[PDB]
Amino acid sequence: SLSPLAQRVVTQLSVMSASRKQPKLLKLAREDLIKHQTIEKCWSIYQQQQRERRNLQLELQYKSIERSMNLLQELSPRLFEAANASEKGKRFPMEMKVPTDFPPNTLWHYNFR
Amino acid sequence: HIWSDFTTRPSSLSIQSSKVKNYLFQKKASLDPPSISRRSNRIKYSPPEHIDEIFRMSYDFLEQRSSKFYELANKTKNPLKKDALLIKAEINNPEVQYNFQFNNKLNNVKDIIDYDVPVYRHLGKQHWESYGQMLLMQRLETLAAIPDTLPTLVPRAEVNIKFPFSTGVNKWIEPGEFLSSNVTSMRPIFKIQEYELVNVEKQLYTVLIVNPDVPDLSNDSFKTALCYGLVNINLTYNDNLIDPRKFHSSNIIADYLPPVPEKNAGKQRFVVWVFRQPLIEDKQGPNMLEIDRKELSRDDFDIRQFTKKYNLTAIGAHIWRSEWDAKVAAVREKYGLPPGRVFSRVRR
Amino acid sequence: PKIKVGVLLSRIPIIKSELNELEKKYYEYQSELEKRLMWTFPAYFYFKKGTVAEHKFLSLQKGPISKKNGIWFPRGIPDIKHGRERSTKQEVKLVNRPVIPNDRITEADRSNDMKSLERQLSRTLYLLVKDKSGTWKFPNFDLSDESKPLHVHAENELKLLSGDQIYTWSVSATPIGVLQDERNRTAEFIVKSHILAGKFDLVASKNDAFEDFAWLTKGEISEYVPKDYFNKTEFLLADN
Amino acid sequence: PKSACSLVKPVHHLVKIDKSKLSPRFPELKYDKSDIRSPGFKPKDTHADRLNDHYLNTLQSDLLLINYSHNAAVVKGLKQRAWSGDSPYHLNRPPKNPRGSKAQLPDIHPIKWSNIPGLESVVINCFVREARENQLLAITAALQLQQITGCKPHPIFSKNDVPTWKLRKGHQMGAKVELKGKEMSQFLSTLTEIVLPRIREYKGISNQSGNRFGGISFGLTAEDIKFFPEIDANQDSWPKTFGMHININTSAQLDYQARTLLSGFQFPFFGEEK
Amino acid sequence: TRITLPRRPAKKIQLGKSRPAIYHQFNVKMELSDGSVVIRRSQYPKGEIRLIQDQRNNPLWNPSRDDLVVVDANSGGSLDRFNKRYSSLFSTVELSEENKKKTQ
RNA sequence: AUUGAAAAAAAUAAUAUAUAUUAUAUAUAUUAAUUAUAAAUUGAAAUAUGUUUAAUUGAAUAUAUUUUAGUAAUAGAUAAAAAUAUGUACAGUAAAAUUGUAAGGAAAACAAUAAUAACUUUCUC
């Protein structure tokens, strides 16, 4: 009837497809609808507040950098040139890694190289 | 719990039905929804899981934020800032949302939707800006009602009209709709719903209906005729249905005359215009103004000069259209007017 | 005004940050909502027909109720397609030793040991060192040579203070901020470094500086650092 | 049609208008996609993202400190060059093209708190050349992208016509998927955690790669895709596997900023920079 | 001569019914080389995986690691057969016996 | 309506019923469905009737009936590769060139490449 490759690919296409593979639409009562709206509204505000707190911290950090640069330049230009040098090829140490859900068996290392 | 107390907050910021409030504030999933009536449908319905715990914390989060806003609102003195702060404090109350989205906003009842509260005023403004204002201005634009009558309009108050006396059937008139001579044969009423903070103990309004389509065979053009004119009308946020109850014969600067089109004279547009009188300070009570009935042509009426002379600011408008039918003759004799003229079917 | 270099070391978190109560419950709510809208599992593809694993999975699962004429159903006529009710979520039940995740609370947490680098895995630790007095502060190192960049001076001086038992990274030569003092006419420059391996282990027996150290976080930095010193550095730390 | 002349009539009001909201048709597009009432609704913040958190916790402040240049100024890009006014022929002359390029280039602003190099999207391009004969193989690409990335793959069809290559225009050959947000974060993490540290001769991403203004790209061979967890588990059902292209888009103004940024997410670099 | 499966009448997803694609996925725990475990959202139905080799045991990703155990695919070869079949001849002292050919 | 929980209502819209007017309106009741449509000795699941084990009841167990499996792409008012080339309504902007990317090179596919003054909303000091 149909080649085995087509049968296999039809199944793979079936896994892609949405035919007879989705539930009924999510219907909420009028009062639960208001319930959901207030949940999202808080989450939206909460995320905005966290974002603004981070931005304000970075505002101050930059303020601190420039005041440090201004003072270093006026006092000792010898160090300022080194500080203002570019970091075009700077790379984070690969030993630093994104946090993992659960810690490793060995928490830390006291030997290097 | 600022939202729980009612020492100074209006009662309108609450769910009148107790069963609804009990479910919305239920501590455990033990009460069935009130909205779904049939018990069979009640059994079939399944609320989403873990929706009560998160709602309670979300409610607390807003509660604290509202309290901060109210405290801030207490220390201010500017009424405009005060209103903005109040709207900002309570806009997030689930009760306020339930009261507004779920109950009539046009014929609002003082218990649920009170338009004296800034929050319901703000929500009503946004709602009208979504659909009603958008539809109105399109009708006024594509029908060339604006430039013919006034340079422009900047809406600030929903306007609705009806003809309850003509036939006895209730139907709010959609702007630009086509109305027979019988339906518009007796009188219109208005519902000038305001949404902007205004001194409703001092402010006064005027209502003019104009028809800039009457043939003018002298100049081979058209001339504008005043249809209905009222001056010095008081209003209230929750009671603003202008009707013979709320005005006397002194306010009528031009008694209503029916739309009476002539045969083959083309469609005629009747544009309702609602303004507001000047607000002069340093005086107690409203600033009554005596309209000059002397000129008041009402046959060749120039709205632009009328507005300029009396310094009126337009805030809302409405429009309907009328053509000739068999009932026009009956309307003419009912109002004791000369029989209408009959024109040709072609332009030459 | 003499220039004085300070260095703030940071221990990056080793485990993911803990979630607040609002975050935990909101995420659970969304996941359940997603499961409600979740699609059918295409078991007919992963599990081939006749495979023993396939038949083991079938028994591992619980079938749905099917529509049947002449029998009433209170919650509604079943709607099953591909062997799953469409009116609610679907549950799919699933050396090869079982994966046992390690505990997120270590020994240093229960023992309340302050010197260790594991006291707070999900937070950021900063090396705060006490002076001759009880005033705890970030290490301030004084230079006079000026023949080396300030960040390099702090790095080399730190290694000799720890007995070459530390591995620190110099994030940048740009000092983070200034802690100026008018009494002694001292200008202090703070440099951001990251600890990679080893511990501090003060070993300088000449009593040149410092007596005690710690690996506190921002919450604990506040209680040990004086308020005036804390105020001028609150923004240079990491909340989580 | 009586005429073909497009001329919109001017309006007499300032109110913005949108016929979609006041047309009764399609009552469900009126709801926003994020709204619960929309059939298009899909939860977004199902769970916390560890990679994003890392960037916002540690790499955010670090990058600001790295890239900061004291009293740096905006470097204007190569824009169109105006015509000097010395002849009566410049009044309506279109402006000249940029100096060395036929396309305008953007400005480069100093890095500040608001603009810190960060990720924005990741695009997987997969062009199975062998599909020219067997179209059925292109479907396997969509499945492979689906299983690995975890998002719906948008298919790739031919656009050009090269007879030397038996290439025909208007045929399906591959699939592509746009990744954003948490799902992109998972892909980037699982790429460096699992797939990348499994190539015998792997040295890293070339420093020469990358669009001038942000954006870094590399490629995975056919055999590298076997290293993904969702193919390693079912090797029986994956007889044929084949490579793809990866493109990481970021908010970096220049490339070198992006390379420093991506290094924080455990990405190695080996070559020499420009 | 191309192999193309014929296309059936595409069903009409009329406006407003465009539901998103939410593919079935499992909260699957990924066990690294060390005890580190990361939760990954995957489609394949089984909750735990061990990674024989991963970033943990890769020198490129851990330049500072002095001790680094190395393990590769176990399909057949040295670790499999050369060891048990030759379990008497032992050592890298023995590697110094065949160290150099001393040829120019 | 019966079916585990212990007097109601005040929105738009849909459906059912009814009736006011030379007005496609109003009153009441309730919030269905929203990716489907014949055809399977064989795969999966389900309920009912018996048995054996393990009062109830878990498992297996034979039969009857039914449901799933015909596994097929667009999930976006989709937007410069292919097909519907005349009507209407809504919406969008191409192309070259450059820089990169496993096979890939001059030529296959993907990604990036002009500036935010003023305005609205939200968060924040």
From Swiss-Prot, chain A:
Location of this fragment in the whole protein: 34 to 146 of 147
Name this protein carries in UniProt: Large ribosomal subunit protein mL40
Functional summary from the UniProt entry: Component of the mitochondrial ribosome (mitoribosome), a dedicated translation machinery responsible for the synthesis of mitochondrial genome-encoded proteins, including at least some of the essential transmembrane subunits of the mitochondrial respiratory chain. The mitoribosomes are attached to the mitochondrial inner membrane and translation products are cotranslationally integrated into the membrane.
GO molecular-function term, one example from the UniProt record: structural constituent of ribosome
Additional record remark: Present with 6300 molecules/cell in log phase SD medium.
Family to which this protein belongs: Belongs to the mitochondrion-specific ribosomal protein mL40 family.
Alphabetized UniProt keyword annotations: Mitochondrion, Ribonucleoprotein, Ribosomal protein, Transit peptide
GO biological process, one term: mitochondrial translation
Higher taxonomy: Eukaryota, Fungi, Dikarya, Ascomycota, Saccharomycotina
GO cellular component, one term: mitochondrion
Keyword Nucleotidyltransferase: no
Subcellular location: Mitochondrion
Organism: Saccharomyces cerevisiae (strain ATCC 204508 / S288c) (Baker's yeast)
Complex formation: Component of the mitochondrial large ribosomal subunit (mt-LSU). Mature yeast 74S mitochondrial ribosomes consist of a small (37S) and a large (54S) subunit. The 37S small subunit contains a 15S ribosomal RNA (15S mt-rRNA) and 34 different proteins. The 54S large subunit contains a 21S rRNA (21S mt-rRNA) and 46 different proteins.
UniProtKB/Swiss-Prot annotation, chain B:
Entry function: Component of the mitochondrial ribosome (mitoribosome), a dedicated translation machinery responsible for the synthesis of mitochondrial genome-encoded proteins, including at least some of the essential transmembrane subunits of the mitochondrial respiratory chain. The mitoribosomes are attached to the mitochondrial inner membrane and translation products are cotranslationally integrated into the membrane.
One function term, GO molecular function aspect: structural constituent of ribosome
Keywords recorded for this protein, A-Z: Mitochondrion, Ribonucleoprotein, Ribosomal protein, Transit peptide
Annotated localization: Mitochondrion
InterPro entries in UniProt: PEBP, PEBP-like_sf, PEBP_euk
GO BP annotations listed: mitochondrial cytochrome c oxidase assembly; mitochondrial translation
One Pfam family recorded for the sequence: PBP
Organism name: Saccharomyces cerevisiae (strain ATCC 204508 / S288c) (Baker's yeast)
Subunit: Component of the mitochondrial large ribosomal subunit (mt-LSU). Mature yeast 74S mitochondrial ribosomes consist of a small (37S) and a large (54S) subunit. The 37S small subunit contains a 15S ribosomal RNA (15S mt-rRNA) and 34 different proteins. The 54S large subunit contains a 21S rRNA (21S mt-rRNA) and 46 different proteins.
Sequence similarity: Belongs to the phosphatidylethanolamine-binding protein family. Mitochondrion-specific ribosomal protein mL38 subfamily.
Name of the gene this protein is made from: MRPL35
Additional note from the record: Present with 7700 molecules/cell in log phase SD medium.
One GO term describing the cellular component: mitochondrion
Main location: mitochondrion
Protein name: Large ribosomal subunit protein mL38
